[PDB]
């Protein structure tokens, strides 16, 4: 393979509740860039394209990471700073609806299929190599890199989990739900910026302009 899954996994290994969540997002935005640089072939792309891919995917990439990290906890989410947020804090803050979708469409499904870190890292790399991002200099080579992750992930799943054929599909069919959840989170965040509700720190603010 040209997109080995070992260097994907190595990237994973290497790295008010709305206020706390936003704070953790800002923190993880710095570490997200470091993750992406470690993904085979991403750092090779033109800078402008690197910028485009991360601005398009950041919200989904981060939601995927904390969702996986939160398999262990009972009705709730482990933030990167170490604080938990639980369904009750979530609902008492006016964001229960979206918090519930995260728990049910992401955390629970990751837990009930027992996604591992290689699988997470690959899914995140697919999200990163989104060839439909507006303004890419060369859509074709991002498509080509996605296709390499798809091929490497499929051969990881046949090899490691040969008891289940509908498992490559099962993993990929978390991505549409991640996109709908991600769009709803962005909606909220533009709305949190708009009224000044919550303090949005520097890097997170940058991801929310145009």
């Amino acid at each position: 393979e040209d997109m080995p899954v070992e260097r994907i996994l190595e990237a994973e290994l290497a790295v008010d509740p709305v206020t706390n969540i936003c704070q953790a997002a800002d923190k993880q935005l710095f570490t997200l860039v470091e993750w992406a640089k470690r993904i085979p072939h991403f750092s090779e792309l033109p800078l402008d394209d690197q910028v485009i891919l991360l601005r398009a995917g950041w919200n989904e990439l981060l939601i995927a990471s904390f969702s996986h990290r939160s398999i262990a906890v009972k009705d709730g989410i482990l933030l990167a700073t170490g604080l938990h947020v639980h369904r009750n804090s979530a609902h008492s803050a006016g964001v229960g609806a979206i918090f519930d979708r995260v728990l049910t469409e992401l955390v629970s499904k990751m837990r009930d299929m027992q996604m591992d870190k290689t699988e997470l890292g690959c899914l995140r790399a697919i999200v990163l190599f989104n060839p439909d991002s507006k303004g890419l200099s060369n859509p074709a080579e991002v498509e080509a890199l996605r296709e390499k992750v798809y091929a490497s992930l499929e051969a990881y799943c046949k090899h490691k989990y040969p008891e289940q054929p509908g498992r490559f599909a099962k993993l990929l069919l978390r991505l549409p739900a991640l996109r709908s959840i991600g769009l709803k989170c962005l909606e909220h965040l533009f709305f949190f910026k708009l009224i000044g509700d919550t303090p949005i720190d520097t890097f997170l603010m940058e991801m929310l302009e145009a």
């Binding site: 910028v51 520097t202 145009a210």
Partner: peptide, 11 residues
Amino acid sequence: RHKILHRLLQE
């Protein structure tokens, strides 16, 4: 438009 992100991707 994206100063932090440009700088961090320098490496």
